Amino acid sequence: EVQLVETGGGLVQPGGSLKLSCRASGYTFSSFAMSWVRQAPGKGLEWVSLINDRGGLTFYVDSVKGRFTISRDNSKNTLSLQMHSLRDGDTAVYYCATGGMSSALQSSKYYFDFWGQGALVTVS
Amino acid sequence: NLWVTVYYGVPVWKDAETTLFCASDHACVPTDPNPQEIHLENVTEEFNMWKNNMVEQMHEDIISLWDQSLKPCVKLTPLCVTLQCTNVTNNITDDMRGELKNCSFNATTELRNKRQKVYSLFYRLDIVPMVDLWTNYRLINCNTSAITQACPKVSFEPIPIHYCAPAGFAILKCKDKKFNGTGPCPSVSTVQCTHGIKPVVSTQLLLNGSLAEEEVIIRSENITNNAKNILVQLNTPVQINCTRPNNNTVKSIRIGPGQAFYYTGDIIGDIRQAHCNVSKATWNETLGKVVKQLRKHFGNNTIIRFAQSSGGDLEVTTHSFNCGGEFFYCNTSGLFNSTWISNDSITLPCRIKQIINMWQRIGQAMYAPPIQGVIRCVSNITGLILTRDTTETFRPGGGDMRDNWRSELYKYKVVKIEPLGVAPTRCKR
Amino acid sequence: LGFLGAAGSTMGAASMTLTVQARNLLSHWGIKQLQARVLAVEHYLRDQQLLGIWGCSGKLICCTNVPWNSSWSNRNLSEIWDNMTWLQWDKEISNYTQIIYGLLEESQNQQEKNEQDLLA
Amino acid sequence: LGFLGAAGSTMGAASMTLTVQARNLLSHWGIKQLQARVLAVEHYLRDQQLLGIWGCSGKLICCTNVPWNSSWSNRNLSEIWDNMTWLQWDKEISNYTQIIYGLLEESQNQQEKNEQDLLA
Amino acid sequence: LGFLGAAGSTMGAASMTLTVQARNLLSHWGIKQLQARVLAVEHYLRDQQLLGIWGCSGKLICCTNVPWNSSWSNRNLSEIWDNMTWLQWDKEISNYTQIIYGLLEESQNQQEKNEQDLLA
Ligand SMILES: *[C@@H]1O[C@H](CO)[C@@H](O[C@@H]2O[C@H](CO)[C@@H](O[C@@H]3O[C@H](CO)[C@@H](O)[C@H](O[C@H]4O[C@H](CO)[C@@H](O)[C@H](O)[C@@H]4O)[C@@H]3O)[C@H](O)[C@H]2NC(C)=O)[C@H](O)[C@H]1NC(C)=O
Ligand SMILES: *[C@@H]1O[C@H](CO[C@@H]2O[C@@H](C)[C@@H](O)[C@@H](O)[C@@H]2O)[C@@H](O[C@@H]2O[C@H](CO)[C@@H](O)[C@H](O)[C@H]2NC(C)=O)[C@H](O)[C@H]1NC(C)=O
Ligand SMILES: *[C@@H]1O[C@H](CO[C@@H]2O[C@@H](C)[C@@H](O)[C@@H](O)[C@@H]2O)[C@@H](O[C@@H]2O[C@H](CO)[C@@H](O)[C@H](O)[C@H]2NC(C)=O)[C@H](O)[C@H]1NC(C)=O
Ligand SMILES: *[C@@H]1O[C@H](CO[C@@H]2O[C@@H](C)[C@@H](O)[C@@H](O)[C@@H]2O)[C@@H](O[C@@H]2O[C@H](CO)[C@@H](O)[C@H](O)[C@H]2NC(C)=O)[C@H](O)[C@H]1NC(C)=O
Ligand SMILES: *[C@@H]1O[C@H](CO)[C@@H](O[C@@H]2O[C@H](CO)[C@@H](O)[C@H](O)[C@H]2NC(C)=O)[C@H](O)[C@H]1NC(C)=O
Ligand SMILES: *[C@@H]1O[C@H](CO)[C@@H](O[C@@H]2O[C@H](CO)[C@@H](O)[C@H](O)[C@H]2NC(C)=O)[C@H](O)[C@H]1NC(C)=O
Ligand SMILES: *[C@@H]1O[C@H](CO)[C@@H](O[C@@H]2O[C@H](CO)[C@@H](O)[C@H](O)[C@H]2NC(C)=O)[C@H](O)[C@H]1NC(C)=O
Ligand SMILES: *[C@@H]1O[C@H](CO)[C@@H](O[C@@H]2O[C@H](CO)[C@@H](O)[C@H](O)[C@H]2NC(C)=O)[C@H](O)[C@H]1NC(C)=O
Ligand SMILES: *[C@@H]1O[C@H](CO[C@@H]2O[C@@H](C)[C@@H](O)[C@@H](O)[C@@H]2O)[C@@H](O)[C@H](O)[C@H]1NC(C)=O
Ligand SMILES: *[C@@H]1O[C@H](CO[C@@H]2O[C@@H](C)[C@@H](O)[C@@H](O)[C@@H]2O)[C@@H](O)[C@H](O)[C@H]1NC(C)=O
Ligand SMILES: *[C@@H]1O[C@H](CO[C@@H]2O[C@@H](C)[C@@H](O)[C@@H](O)[C@@H]2O)[C@@H](O)[C@H](O)[C@H]1NC(C)=O
Ligand SMILES: *[C@@H]1O[C@H](CO)[C@@H](O)[C@H](O)[C@H]1NC(C)=O
Ligand SMILES: *[C@@H]1O[C@H](CO)[C@@H](O)[C@H](O)[C@H]1NC(C)=O
Ligand SMILES: *[C@@H]1O[C@H](CO)[C@@H](O)[C@H](O)[C@H]1NC(C)=O
Ligand SMILES: *[C@@H]1O[C@H](CO)[C@@H](O)[C@H](O)[C@H]1NC(C)=O
Ligand SMILES: *[C@@H]1O[C@H](CO)[C@@H](O)[C@H](O)[C@H]1NC(C)=O
Ligand SMILES: *[C@@H]1O[C@H](CO)[C@@H](O)[C@H](O)[C@H]1NC(C)=O
Ligand SMILES: *[C@@H]1O[C@H](CO)[C@@H](O)[C@H](O)[C@H]1NC(C)=O
Ligand SMILES: *[C@@H]1O[C@H](CO)[C@@H](O)[C@H](O)[C@H]1NC(C)=O
Ligand SMILES: *[C@@H]1O[C@H](CO)[C@@H](O)[C@H](O)[C@H]1NC(C)=O
Ligand SMILES: *[C@@H]1O[C@H](CO)[C@@H](O)[C@H](O)[C@H]1NC(C)=O
Ligand SMILES: *[C@@H]1O[C@H](CO)[C@@H](O)[C@H](O)[C@H]1NC(C)=O
Ligand SMILES: *[C@@H]1O[C@H](CO)[C@@H](O)[C@H](O)[C@H]1NC(C)=O
Ligand SMILES: *[C@@H]1O[C@H](CO)[C@@H](O)[C@H](O)[C@H]1NC(C)=O
Ligand SMILES: *[C@@H]1O[C@H](CO)[C@@H](O)[C@H](O)[C@H]1NC(C)=O
Ligand SMILES: *[C@@H]1O[C@H](CO)[C@@H](O)[C@H](O)[C@H]1NC(C)=O
Ligand SMILES: *[C@@H]1O[C@H](CO)[C@@H](O)[C@H](O)[C@H]1NC(C)=O
Ligand SMILES: *[C@@H]1O[C@H](CO)[C@@H](O)[C@H](O)[C@H]1NC(C)=O
Ligand SMILES: *[C@@H]1O[C@H](CO)[C@@H](O)[C@H](O)[C@H]1NC(C)=O
Ligand SMILES: *[C@@H]1O[C@H](CO)[C@@H](O)[C@H](O)[C@H]1NC(C)=O
C-alpha cells in the first residue's frame, strides 16, 4: 500500500508565505518524480510544479514560477513546497502526487500514479 | 522510442595477453605498499591455468635475470685441461666411496709466460674418466659449452617478485579456496599487482610456496591423461632439514689479470654424505591426505601406490634444490615407496655438484664456487609434482620449471579493460 | 567504490562510476616496460578519437541521434538497466557493435554538415 | 571510398571523407619502431592541441570568426570548392598559413574572455 | 611575452598568456630520449583527461558550478587577481587542492545526469 500524506498549513493572509510538506511511504521514494496538483474549491485540476527523483530538476507553471519553491529530501521520504506572496487566487487544495516524469533509464511516466488527499490552503 | 547512448568508463573487460612488469624491494619497480584489492561482490569469472600467459612471462624473466647475473663473472676456459685425479687422503665412509677425487692440474696465471700447479677436490659427478694419456680425467663440460664461474658476491636467495599490470589492464584473483585451476570462480577480486612470488627452483618437491587454505588440492590439466603432470598442493607444510656436514677449506688462485678461481682445498674432519631429513609420521599423514583426494578422481575402491622415478638423468630423478648456495640432488625413493589399499625420520642421501646447467639448456654451464664451512638449511615442502603410469602408480616428476610457477600463478588472470560501450536509453540530441 | 567495484552491479548503478574506471586508463631490460607505456597511450587515444568522431568528445555520457533497431536487443529498459550487469550486456550485443559504430559515425557527419548550413 | 581516395577530387567532394583520413592517423633492434610509434602520437597530439587552442575541439568542420583577407587567395567559392583539389589549394595558400593560424588563436582568446565576462 | 614570461606578473595579467604555456607542453644510449618523450605525453594526457572529467575539455578558461569556501582562502577578488602572482597563489592554496578537484568531479557527474534527463 502506497500512501502520500499532506501535512500542510491552514489559513494565511495574502502576501505572506505558507509551507506544505508531504510524507511518503510504501514505495521507494527516491525512485519516483513527484508533483503538486492544485484544485480550487470550485474548479478542476491544475498542474503546479514538478520535481525530479534526485531533486536536481524542477519545473513550474508560469503563474507560480517566481513565487514557489519545490523541494525534496530522499532520506526523510519527504516532498515539500514553499509558497510566497500568496495570492487570493492561490486558494486551493494542494495534492501530493507521484509521477509526472521519468529518469531516462526508466520506462516513461507522463501521468500520475498515486495521490495523497490534499492540504487545504486558504488565502484571505 | 529508444536511442543509442554512448557510455565511457564502462566496467567491462576481455581476456588478454599483455606485457607485465615486475616490482620488488637486476631491479625494476619498487614494491607497491598497497595492492588495493577490490572485492567485486557479484562477479563470477572463468579461470584457466595452463593456458595462462603469466607463466610464460615469469619463465622468461627468471631465466633472463639468471643469465644477466653471470655476465661480469670469470669464464673458466683456462681450466679445460687434462687432470691427474687420485683418491682423497682422509676417513671416507662407504656412502662416500671414491665420491670425491684429488685432482691436480696446470693452471694459467697472471702472466702468459708462467704456469702454476694447482690441486683441488672435485665431486665425481663433475669429472669424466677420459683423457687416458699421461693423466686421468677432464672436467664434465669441456666437450659442450664453457663453464662460467658464478661471482662469489652473488647469492641465489629466492627474493620474491611481484607482477604488476600496465595501465588499461587489471589482474583478477580467484579467492575460491576449493579452486582446482579451471572453470568458473564465484569469488573474484581485482588487484593492481600480484603478491610476491618466490622464484624457488626445485624439482619433484616444491619448496617454500603457498599452502592450500583448507584441504589438499590436486590440480591437473587432464587427470585421466598420463601425459600430464599432477600438481598437488598441501594444506600443511612438511619440514625438511638439509645438511652438508663437511667443514671445507676454500682456497683461491688467480688464473688471469683479475680473474680469481675458487675451489675446495681440503676437508676438515671425516667425509660423510650430504643428506635431508623428513619427519616420518608427518610424511605418512601427508600422503594419507593426498591419497584420500586422489580417490575422488580415480576409483574409490582402489589402490594407490607410490614409486621412485623410473629414469632420466640426475636432474629429474632426484630432488634438485639450492641449499645455502650448494646444489643438492637428493634421493626421494625413501619418500615414495608405499602402497595404500582401500621420533622417527626419513633420511634422503644427497649428491652434490659444482658444475650445473640450471635450465634445460645445452649451451650454458655454471660453476658454483664451493662454500667455506658447513651448510645447513630448513625448507617447507608445500607441494608435490607427480605423474601417473587395478592399482594406480604415481611417481615424482617436475622436470619443467614452468610447473613450479603454475603452482603460484594459478589464481591470477589478466584482463584488458574496454571502457567504451553502448546501450539504449530514452535520451536523444 | 574502487576500480571495477561496480562490475557485478546493474547497469543502472554502474553508470555512476564511470570516472572511477576512466581514471585507471592512464598510468633488453626496461624495453618491454616502455612498450607497455606506449601501447597504453595508443589505446587511450583511439577511444578518444572515436568519441570525437561521434560528437561525444569531452563527455562520459553521450546521447545520440541514432535509434535502437530492436533486432539488436528487444529487451525493455526495466530489464536492461535494472537486471543485467554491463558484462552480460556487452556479451549480448557484442555481435552487432561494428554496425552501431558505423551508424554513429554517419549520424555525426550529417549533423556537422547540417550545422554548417545553419550558420550560413 | 578508402584512405586518400578523394585526394584527386574537388574540395567540395573531398570534405565528405574527413573521417576516412582521421582514422588513419593512429595505428638496438625495435628502437626505431618505438620512435616511429612515439612520433605518430606526438604529431597527432599537436594537431589536437591546436584545434583546442582555436576552439575547434571535438569537431572535423569548424567555423570561426576570422575573415578571409582576399590577399591570401582572391578566388571565388565556385572555383575554390568546385575546380580545385585540396592538394592544389594547400600549395596556393601555403605561404600565408602561419598568419592564419595566428589570427585564429587571437580570435579564440578574445572569445574566451568575452564569454567569462557574460557568464558573470 | 614568451614561455613563462608572465610568471612574475599578477594573475590578472598572466591569464592572458595561457596559450603561450600550453603550446610548450608538447615536443642503452639514447633510450632515455624515448623515455623523456613518453613521459611528456603521459603528463599531457593526464591533464586533458582531468579537464574532461570536470567538463572543461577544449578550453583554457573554464567556469564551474563549485563555490569558493572561504576556508580555502578568504582573500578578496582584488588581492588575488591584481596583487598576487600565480606562483604565490599556488603556494597559498596547495593543501586545499585535492579537495577542489574532488568537488569539481562530483559537480560534473551531477551535471551530466541532470542534462540527460532533460533530453527526454
Ligand atoms: C626456504 O626458506 C628458508 C627461510 O628463509 C630459507 O633459509 C634461509 O637461507 C639463507 C640462505 O642460505 C640463510 O642466509 C644466510 O644465513 C647465514 C647465517 O650464518 C649467513 O651467514 C649468510 O650470510 C653469508 O653468505 C652470504 C651469501 O649467501 C653473503 O652475502 C654474506 O655476506 C655472508 O658471507 C646468509 O645470510 C638464512 O639464514 C636461512 N633462514 C633460516 C631461518 O634458516 C631456505 O633457503 C628456503 N629454501 C629454498 C629452497 O629456497
Ligand atoms: C533493422 O534491422 C533489420 C534486420 O537487421 C539485420 O540483422 C540484424 C540481426 C542486425 O545485424 C541488423 O544490423 C541487420 O540490419 C533491417 O532489415 C534489413 O536491413 C538490411 C539493411 O540494413 C536490408 O539489406 C535487408 O533487406 C532488410 N531486411 C531484413 C532481412 O530484415 C532493418 O532495415 C533495420 N532497420 C533500421 C531502422 O535500421
Ligand atoms: C589584408 O592584407 C593586406 C596586405 O597585407 C600584406 O599581405 C598579407 C598576406 C600579410 O603578409 C601582410 O603582413 C602584408 O602586409 C593588409 O594591408 C597591410 O596590413 C599590414 C598589417 O597586417 C600593414 O602593416 C600594411 O601597412 C598594410 N598595407 C599593405 C598593403 O601592405 C590588410 O590590412 C590585411 N587586412 C586584414 C583583414 O588584416
Ligand atoms: C568549508 O570549510 C569549513 C572548514 O572545513 C575545514 O577546512 C576545509 C578546507 C576542509 O579541509 C574540511 O574538511 C575542514 O573541516 C567546513 O566546516 C567543517 O566541515 C567539516 C566537513 O564538512 C565538518 O565535519 C565540520 O563540522 C565543519 N565545521 C564547521 C565549522 O562547520 C565547511 O563545511 C566547508 N563548507 C563547504 C562548502 O564544504
Ligand atoms: C692432494 O694431493 C696433494 C699433492 O699434489 C697433497 O698435498 C701434499 O700433502 C703432503 C702431506 O701428505 C705435504 O707434505 C705436501 O707439502 C703437500 N703438497 C702440496 C703442493 O700442498 C694433498 O694433501 C692431497 N689432498 C687430499 C685430500 O688427498
Ligand atoms: C661429453 O662427454 C660425455 C661423457 O663421456 C658424453 O656422454 C656419453 O656418450 C656415450 C656415447 O658416445 C654414451 O655411451 C655414454 O653412456 C654417455 N655418458 C654419460 C654419463 O651419459 C657426451 O655425449 C659428450 N658430449 C659431447 C658434446 O660430445
Ligand atoms: C638426520 O637424522 C640422523 C638420524 O638418522 C641424525 O644423525 C644422528 O645425529 C646425532 C647428533 O650428532 C648423533 O649422535 C647420532 O649418532 C646420529 N645418528 C646416525 C644414525 O647417524 C642427523 O643429525 C639428522 N640431521 C640433519 C638434517 O642435520
Ligand atoms: C635411490 O636409492 C635406491 C636404493 O635404495 C636406488 O634403487 C636401486 O636402483 C638399481 C638400478 O640402478 C636397481 O637395480 C635396484 O634394485 C634398486 N634398489 C631398490 C631397493 O629398489 C635408486 O636408483 C636411487 N635413486 C636415485 C634417483 O638415485
Ligand atoms: C519487460 O519484459 C519482461 C519480460 O517480458 C517480455 O520479454 C522482453 C524480452 C520484452 O520483449 C518485453 O516486451 C516482453 O514483455 C516483462 O516481465 C516486464 O513486465 C517488462 N517490463 C516492461 C516495463 O515492459
Ligand atoms: C567565379 O569566377 C568565374 C570566372 O571569373 C573570371 O575568371 C577568374 C579566373 C577571375 O579572373 C575573375 O576575376 C574573372 O571575372 C565567374 O564565371 C563566376 O561567375 C564567379 N563566381 C562568383 C560567385 O563570383
Ligand atoms: C580586500 O581586503 C583588504 C584587507 O585584506 C584583509 O586581509 C586579507 C588577508 C583577507 O583576509 C581579506 O579578505 C581581508 O579583508 C583591503 O585592504 C582591501 O581594500 C580589500 N579590497 C576590496 C576589493 O574590498
Ligand atoms: C683414518 O682412520 C684411522 C682409524 O682406522 C685413524 O687412526 C686415522 O687417524 C684416520 N685418518 C684421518 C685423516 O682422519
Ligand atoms: C680409489 O677409490 C675407488 C672407488 O671407491 C676404488 O675402487 C679404488 O680401489 C681406490 N684406489 C686407491 C689407490 O685407493
Ligand atoms: C575442476 O573443476 C571443474 C568444475 O566445473 C570440472 O569441470 C573439472 O573437470 C575439474 N578438473 C580437475 C582436474 O579436477
Ligand atoms: C583427456 O585425454 C583423453 C585421452 O584418451 C581424451 O579422450 C579426453 O577427451 C581428454 N580430456 C580433456 C578434458 O582434455
Ligand atoms: C629441524 O631443526 C629444528 C631446530 O632448528 C628442529 O626443531 C626440527 O625438529 C628439525 N626438523 C626435522 C624434520 O628434523
Ligand atoms: C602409514 O599409514 C599406513 C596405512 O595403511 C599404516 O599401515 C602405517 O603403519 C603408517 N606409518 C606411520 C609411520 O604412521
Ligand atoms: C568413497 O568412500 C567414502 C567412505 O570412506 C564415502 O564417504 C565417499 O562418498 C565415497 N565416494 C565415492 C565416489 O564413492
Ligand atoms: C621399499 O620397502 C621394502 C620393504 O620390505 C624394502 O625392502 C625396499 O628396499 C624399499 N624400496 C626402496 C626404494 O626404498
Ligand atoms: C672448520 O675448522 C676451523 C679450524 O681452524 C674452525 O676454525 C672452523 O670454525 C670450523 N668450521 C666449522 C663449520 O666446523
Ligand atoms: C613453514 O611454515 C610455518 C607456518 O607456521 C612458518 O612459520 C615457517 O617459517 C615456514 N618455514 C619456512 C622455511 O618457510
Ligand atoms: C549483489 O547482489 C545482491 C542481491 O543478491 C544486492 O543486494 C547487492 O547490492 C549486489 N552488489 C553489487 C556490488 O551490485
Ligand atoms: C530481474 O531478475 C529477477 C530474477 O530473475 C526477476 O524476478 C525479475 O522479474 C527481473 N526483472 C526484470 C523485469 O528484468
Ligand atoms: C554472434 O556470432 C556468432 C558467430 O556467428 C554466433 O555463434 C552467435 O550466436 C552470435 N550471437 C548473437 C548475439 O547473435
Ligand atoms: C576526375 O576528373 C573528371 C573530369 O576530367 C571527373 O569527371 C571525375 O569524376 C574525377 N574523378 C574523381 C575521383 O574525382
Ligand atoms: C576545372 O574546370 C575546367 C573547366 O574547363 C576543367 O577543364 C578542369 O578539368 C576542372 N578541374 C577539376 C579539378 O575539376
Ligand atoms: C611563396 O613564397 C615563395 C618565395 O620563394 C615563392 O616562390 C612562392 O611562389 C610563394 N607562393 C605563394 C605566392 O603563395
Ligand atoms: C614588475 O613590477 C613592476 C612594478 O609594479 C611592474 O610595473 C612590472 O610590469 C612588473 N613585471 C611584470 C613582468 O609584470
Ligand atoms: C594589495 O594588498 C594590500 C593589502 O590589502 C592593499 O593595501 C593594496 O592596495 C593592494 N594593492 C592592489 C593593487 O590591489
Ligand atoms: C599545509 O600543511 C602543512 C603541514 O600541516 C603545513 O606545514 C603548511 O603550512 C600548510 N600550508 C597551507 C597552504 O596551509
Rounded CA separation A3/A115 (Å): 8
Burial profile C48-61: b = 16 or more Cβ within 10 angstroms, e = fewer? bbbbbbbbbbbbbb
Ligand nearest to the CA of C12: 22
Distance of alpha carbon B194 from the chain centroid: 19
Is the Cα torsion angle A107, A111, A116, A121 positive or negative in sign? positive
> Residue B47's Cα: distance from chain center in Å?
24
State whether residue A95 is helix, strand or coil. strand
Query: How many Å apart are CA B147 and CA A102, to the nearest integer?
Result: 78
Spatial separation of the C-alpha atoms in residues B316 and D23, rounded to whole Å: 55
Question: For residue B46, which of B191, B172, B176, B185 has the smallest C-alpha distance?
Answer: B185
Contact B65, B156 (CB under 8 A): no
Give the strand order in the sheet containing B162-164.
Answer: B29-30, B21-24, B162-164
DSSP state letter for A96? E
> Distance between CA atoms of A12 and B66, rounded to whole angstroms?
90
Long-range (24+ apart) CB contacts under 8 A made by D91-100 are D96/D71, D96/D72, D99/D72, D100/D66, D100/D72
Cβ distance of C55 and D60 shorter than 8 Å:
no
On whether any CB of chain C is under 8 Å from the CB of A107, the answer is: yes
> What's the CATH code of the domain at A70?
2.60.40.10
> How far is B168 from B190, CA to CA, in rounded Å?
13
- Alpha-carbon torsion B58, B324, B248, B353, what sign? negative
CB atoms within 10 A of CB B151: 14
Spell out a b/e string for D40-72, using b for 16 or more CB atoms within 10 Å of the CB, else e. ebbebbeebbbbbbbbbbbbbeeeeebeeeeee
DSSP state of D85: B
CA terminus-to-terminus distance, chain D: 48
How far apart are alpha carbons D49 and B31 in whole angstroms? Answer: 36
Count Cβ neighbours within 10 Å for each residue of A52-76 and write b for 16 or more, e otherwise: bbebebebbeeebeeebebebeeee
Q: Write out the H or E segment, with its range, that includes residue E13.
A: helix E11-14
Residue whose CA is closest, atom 6 of ligand 13?
B98
C33 touches chain E (CB under 8 A): no
For residues A35 and A113, is the Cβ–Cβ distance under 8 A? no
Pairing of strands B205-207, B373-388: antiparallel
Q: CA B352, CA B392: separation in Å to the nearest integer?
A: 33
Nearest CA, atom 2, ligand 25: D9
State which residues form the domain around A21: 3-123
| Chain D and chain A touch, per 3+ beta carbon pairs within 8 A | no
CA separation for the pair D53, D109 (Å, rounded)? 8
**Alpha-carbon separation of residue B293 from B289, B298, B299, B354, B389 (angstroms):** 7, 9, 11, 39, 18
For residue A90, give the amino acid letter.
D
Q: HEC string of chain B?
A: CCEEEEEECCCCEEECCCCCEEEECCCCEECCCCCCCECCCCCCEEEECCCCCHHHHHHHHHHHHHHHHCCCCCECCCCCCCCEEECCCCCECHHHCCCEEEEEEEEECCCCCCEEEEEEEEEHHHEECCCCCCCECEECCCCCCCEEECCCCCCCCCCCEEEECCCCEEEEEECCCCCCCEEEECCEEEECECCCECCCCCCCEEECCCCCCCCCEEEECCCCCCCCCEEEEEEEEEEEEEEEEEEEEEEEEEEECCEEEEEEEEEECCECCEEEEEEHHHHHHHHHHHHHHHCCCCCCCCEEEECCCCCCCHHHHCEEEEECCEEEEECCCCCCCEEEECCCEEEEEEEEECEECCCCCCCCEEECCCCCEEEEEEEEEEEEEEEECCCEEEEECCCCCHHHHHHHHCCEEEEEECCEEEEEECCEC
Contact call for residues B406 and B231 (beta carbons, < 8 A): yes
Which segments of chain C does DSSP mark as H helices, in order? 11-14, 18-22, 31-53, 77-80, 86-92, 98-119
**C-chain residues within 8 Å CB-CB of B71?**
none
Let me know: does B267 contact B356? Beta carbons within 8 Å. Answer: no
What cell numbers appear for C70 in the block?
A: 530492436
Cβ proximity of B156 and B146 under 8 Å: no
Q: Which residues contact B231 (CB under 8 A, 6 or more apart)?
A: B218, B219, B220, B383, B384, B385, B403, B406, B407
Q: Does E57 touch chain D (CB under 8 A)?
A: yes
CA–CA separation, B21 and B37 (whole Å): 18
DSSP label of A8 = -
- Spatial neighbors of B247 by CB under 8 A, at least 6 apart, are B267, B268, B269, B373, B374
Encoded amino acid at B421, one letter: G
Q: Which three cell numbers stand for residue B401?
A: 620449471
Neighbour tally for B311: CB within 10 Å: 7
Kindly list the distances between the CA atom of residue B127 and the CA atoms of B84, B103, B140, B142, B354, in Å, as whole numbers in the listed order.
11, 10, 5, 10, 10
Chains B and A touch (3+ CB pairs under 8 A): yes
Q: How far is the C-alpha of B217 from the C-alpha of B215, rounded, in Å?
A: 6
Task: State the distance from the centre of ligand 22 to the C-alpha of C12, rounded, in angstroms.
Answer: 13
CB contact under 8 A, D41 and C46: no
Count how many Cα atoms sit within 13 Å of the Cα of residue E97 in the half-sphere of its side chain: 7
Closest CA to B337 of B394, B290, B296: B394
Q: Which residues of B154-179 are buried (b: 16+ CB within 10 A; e: fewer)?
A: eebebebbbbbbbbbbbbbbbebeeb
Q: How far is the CA of B185 from the centre of ligand 13 (A)?
A: 61
The domain of C13 spans 1-120
The single-letter DSSP state of residue E52 is H
Phi and psi at residue A26, to the nearest 5°: 95, -5
Pocket test for ligand 16, best of B278, B378, B380, B381 (most atoms within 8 A of CB): B378
How far is residue C51's CA from residue B421's CA, in Å, rounded to a whole number? 11
Tell me if residue E34 falls in helix, strand or coil.
helix
Tell how far the Cα of B140 is from the centroid of ligand 6, in angstroms. Answer: 10
Query: Measuring CA to CA, how many Å separate E22 from each of D106, E44, E88?
Result: 14, 10, 20
Cβ contacts of B170 on chain C, cutoff 8 Å: 3-4, 24
Torsion over CA of E18, E19, E21 and E27, rounded to 10 degrees? 160
The residue of chain B with its CA nearest to that of E116 is B427
Cell of D94: 601555403
Which is nearest to B251 in space by CA: B270, B269, B273, B267? B267
Angle (CA) B403-B409-B412 rounded to 5° is 145
Query: From CA B250, how far away is CA B247, in angstroms rounded?
Result: 10
Q: Chain B within 8 Å of E119 (Cβ-Cβ)?
A: yes
Report the residue of chain B nearest C111, measured CA to CA: B429
Compute φ and ψ for A63, nearest 5 degrees.
-65, -15
Half-sphere exposure of E5 toward its Cβ, with a 13 Å CA cutoff? 10
CA of B239, closest atom in ligand 16: 13
Contact A106, C11 (CB under 8 A): no
Method: cryo-EM
Find out whether the beta carbon of B268 lies less than 6 Å from any atom of ligand 20: yes
Kindly state the cell numbers that stand for C43: 589505446
Q: Is E75 left (phi over 0), alpha (psi -120 to 50) or beta?
A: beta
Give the cell for residue D11. 574540395
Ligand 7: centre distance to CA B345 (Å) = 10
Residue found under cell 702472466: B111
Lookup result for grid cell 601501447 = C39
Using a CB–CB cutoff of 8 Å, tell me whether C69 touches chain D: no
Q: Hey, whose CA ends up nearest to atom 11 of ligand 5?
A: B89
Q: Which ligand is nearest to the CA of B183?
A: 14
Q: Residue A48: in which H helix or E strand, if any?
A: strand A45-51
User: What's the N-to-C CA distance of chain E in angstroms?
Assistant: 49
**In contact, C62 and C47? CB cutoff 8 Å:** no
How far apart are the C-alpha atoms of A1 and A24, rounded to whole Å? Answer: 11
Degrees (nearest 5) of the Cα angle C89, C93, C95? 145
Q: Which of B376, B407, B51, B414 has the alpha carbon at shortest distance from B200? A: B407
Q: Please report which ligand is nearest the Cα atom of E75.
A: 11
**In this structure, what are the phi and psi dihedrals at residue B69, rounded to the nearest 5 degrees?**
-70, -15
CA-CA distance, B160 to B197, in Å (whole number)?
A: 5
Instruction: Name the neighbours of D, counting chains with at least 3 Cβ pairs within 8 A.
Output: C, E
Specified resolution (Å): 3.7
* Range B361-367, long-range pairs (CB < 8 A, 24+ positions): B362/B144, B362/B145, B363/B144, B363/B145, B364/B67, B364/B145, B364/B148, B365/B141, B365/B144, B365/B145, B365/B146, B365/B147, B365/B148, B366/B70, B366/B147, B366/B148, B366/B149, B366/B150, B367/B76, B367/B147, B367/B148, B367/B149, B367/B150
Count structural domains, chain E: 1
Residue of D nearest to C38 (CA): D38
CA distances from B101 to A18, B121, B314 (A): 109, 6, 19
Q: Mutate which of A52, A109, A110 to test chain E, going by most E C-beta atoms within 10 A?
A: A52
Q: Do C55 and D57 touch (CB under 8 A)?
A: no
**Rounded distance between C-alpha atoms, residue E38 and residue C40, angstroms:** 11
Check A107 against C77: CB less than 8 A apart: yes
Question: Helix count (H) and strand count (E) of chain E?
Answer: 6, 0
Domains held by chain A: number: 1
